[PDB]
């Protein structure tokens with residue numbers, strides 16, 4: 108009941124009902140949480 | 156005791172020398188890393204019946220961009236502060252031509268002096284602190300991201316790039332610890348820079364109202 | 365005979381309860397492993413546990429080896445009578 | 461409180477059909493037994509304690 | 510440490526101080542019966558609370574059919590070779606797993622810890 | 624362990640064995656048999672007989688078990704039970720080489736030139752609970768352990784550039800007053816935190832509330848090995864702290880909103896707010 | 901980028917959630933074209949470098965030309981570009997893949 112009307116507007120900003128900006132980009136990245144998956148960096152762990 | 160008292164006065168001093176360095180004032184380099192025994196030798200070994208009187212500790216600094224605008228900080232002597240006692244300072248500012256002033260209150264102030272500082276709005280702006288709060292730099296904590304205050308020329312670039320008004324930004328009230336650490340007035344915009352795990356870096360803005 | 369020494373931050377009772385739980389939990393595990401390493405390739409419990417269709421590796425040991433130790437409110441069975449759990453025991457019996 | 465800190469807790473009673481709390485020694489005296497050697501033998505059964 | 514009752518109206522005698530001979534006087538507040546104090550101390554407050562319950566357990570507990578018994582530890586005062594033991598069953602249960610005994614011989618009632 | 628004891632709160636009734644109110648009309652009377660030695664070796668050095676000598680005495684016995692565990696001895700107690708309450712009291716004490724630690728107190732005789740007995744009992748019943756020996760008032764019990772997981776370890780980047788974890792002692796309390804705990808010495812002011820978020824709001828700010836709330840949501844979700852994507856946590860903890868202050872998601876939080884009149888009529892106060900409108 | 905990762909992820913883990921898988925996309929291309937990992941390859945390295953640059957240019961999340969809209973784009977696709985540059989380097993794709 109709290110968060111009913113938050114949605115992504117046509118310029119990729121996540122706005123409230125009164126158009127109060129909540130995030131400049133959805134999830135801070137801009138991607139849907141449906142087409143992502145786990146990977147590894149393989150650059151931070153090894154030694155110098 | 157005094158060993159606890161010579162320790163605190165050095166700690167509180169080291170904090171303020173960064174607080175005024177953040178606001179963009181000019182502080183000499185070695186003043187930032189003034190170790191304890193160096194402080195103990197310069198200003199005095201002990202303030203209990205000693206040379207450090209909580210006066211002889213005051214600081215006057217000048218801005219980087221302009222040598223005229225200066226800031227003062229006062230260390231009152233009484234635990235809680237009265238009325239003319241700040242007017243003693245208001246007179247000390249009146250004589251030296253300085254508007255930016257701070258007072259490091261020792262333990263408290265009277266509802267009296269709360270009325271006596273909100274009146275001189277257009278001139279002689281003073282900031283009231285507490286001795287306890289200045290004992291630790293909160294800006295170097297883990298949870299606190301990095302804030303930066305934007306000039307009034309940059310703020311008009313946001314609202315014209317994202318085609319925003321100034322009512323549509325996220326808000327911050329000028330009463331929380333970091334709003335006062337930077338000396339922020341209503342109508343300013345502060346920029347937060349935090350690292351995130353999905354993108355790597357994210358910049359958000361806050362309107363102080 | 366007052367030969368126990370409490371550990372930092374532990375009452376004498378609570379140190380005793382913690383050790384009695386360790387002895388009993390290890391028997392549920394060590395007996396449980398015995399129930400498994402004796403199973404066969406044709407067993408039908410192992411066939412539903414291995415493929416992940418239904419069941420867990422503790423139901424095998426509970427059916428074959430030992431049900432284990434019960435507890436209400438996250439602690440051992442309390443003294444519902446006065447200094448007893450049932451009228452079939454003698455007072456202040458702390459056995460398993 | 462800087463007053464009852466020294467004396468300690470006071471035994472009270474909440475009788476039916478009355479509004480306010482009542483100290484127990486009062487309701488004891490309302491039955492007779494005004495003396496304090498006779499009251500303190502109905503409540504304490506051995507004076508070596 | 511005890512208590513004092515008035516000898517006339519049977520009430521509680523309060524302690525008072527007289528500025529003449531430097532002696533504690535017990536006074537009444539209904540009448541004014543007087544007398545002097547023999548121990549000259551008023552208040553005592555035991556915070557350790559290390560009272561040994563050997564002074565609180567009763568000798569007739571050896572008639573309980575729901576308590577364990579022993580043939581190992583005999584009684585010293587009578588030589589009976591059967592006892593009945595239990596725990597503190599009271600407060601001060603921080604390190605309270607001692608084991609008080611009571612002889613079960615009729616009319617001995619001897620009690621002892623170990 | 625020393626900083627542990629220095630942080631924990633300790634009152635007087637935790638370090639006392641028993642107390643007794645005696646009656647010495649003269650300091651040489653010494654009603655109890657054996658305290659005459661030390662009180663006398665004070666008495667040949669007699670000071671502070673200014674107005675009178677109070678015939679009422681207060682005698683306190685201490686437990687060296689509870690004394691040494693906090694590294695206390697009655698010297699510091701003796702000055703602070705004086706320095707902190709006034710000078711109306713006067714404390715003479717034993718030497719700790721004697722097995723039992725007793726210190727006797729009399730009222731300042733300047734008052735004798737409301738009964739003093741009830742006053743002395745009031746003071747006795749007031750000092751054992753309002754002692755404030757050490758530590759912060761509200762934090763009651765503080766534990767100690769070093770973890771084995773990589774969650775609370777100290778991960779450093781060595782000189783050759785490898786992540787190495789180190790076991791380090793951490794402390795956990797039951798009770799919160801963080802602004803003072805942060806200000807103490809040899810306590811890390813960066814990584815110390817509290818699990819209450821209104822406290823972080825008053826002490827640290829608003830962004831710290833955002834991040835702490837996110838962390839606690841993550842910790843409660845990933846407790847049983849489950850997993851939930853990040854965007855949902857971020858969006859929730861962003862819309863929850865958007866208007867500057869902490870508005871809870873409750874009936875009151877929804878009421879204080881910039882939303883229209885026909886939405887607050889769907890929540891239990893239709894007619895009055897619509898009459899206002 | 902190796903030094904920036906060590907401050908983004910202080911603990912030291914390596915499991916992150918990202919767009920399209922890269923190791924599986926290399927494994928697929930190794931079989932749509934019958935790549936024999938036994939003979940010398942014909943992939944010039946300065947081709948790898950410039951191809952990865954050009955690809956990184958065409959991944960716009962925030963489309964704009966002026967600053968404050970050309971740095972938010974670099975903040976959005978910061979982690980993915982690091983991953984893409986570390987996986988498709990010239991040494992690895994001439995040695996392993």
Ligand SMILES: [Zn+2]
Nearest residue numbers: 515518537540
């Ligand atoms: Zn009488």
Ligand SMILES: [Zn+2]
Nearest residue numbers: 584587612617
């Ligand atoms: Zn016997």
